[PDB]
Amino acid sequence: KTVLSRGYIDNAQFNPLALRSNVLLMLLQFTLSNLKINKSSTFTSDVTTI
Amino acid sequence: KTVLSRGYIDNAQFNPLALRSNVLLMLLQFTLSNLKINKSSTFTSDVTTI
């Protein structure tokens, strides 16, 4: 419900005629949310039998 | 439990995976605990039987 849905459809519905745009925006947010650097950490060995 | 054991092992346990190292250190302590000179002492002549 990013666009074309604010005061046009009910709170329990979704606009079927604007699906492509909303999906595209949702993916864009998905993409922007993962812009990070996979930093290293402290590696160690285990003395466990497994 | 000289090394690689404290902090996770139980009092009653030992870790087989790190056995050789701990055994080695125990022997090392055994060796170090004997570096000393054999001093000579006084003597007495014996008169007892054979």
Swiss-Prot record, chains A, B:
Compartment annotation: Virion
Coiled coil, from the record: none
Known partners and oligomeric status: Homodecamer; each decamer is made up of two conformers of VP2, called VP2A and VP2B. 12 homodecamers assemble to form an icosahedral capsid. Interacts with VP6.
Function: Inner capsid protein that self-assembles to form an icosahedral capsid with a T=2 symmetry, which consists of 120 copies of VP2, with channels at each of its five-fold vertices. This capsid constitutes the innermost concentric layer of the viral mature particle.
Family: Belongs to the turreted BTV-fold inner capsid family.
Full protein name: Inner capsid protein VP3
Organism: Aquareovirus C (isolate Golden shiner/USA/GSRV/1977) (AQRV-C)
Portion of the parent chain present: 275 to 324 of 1214
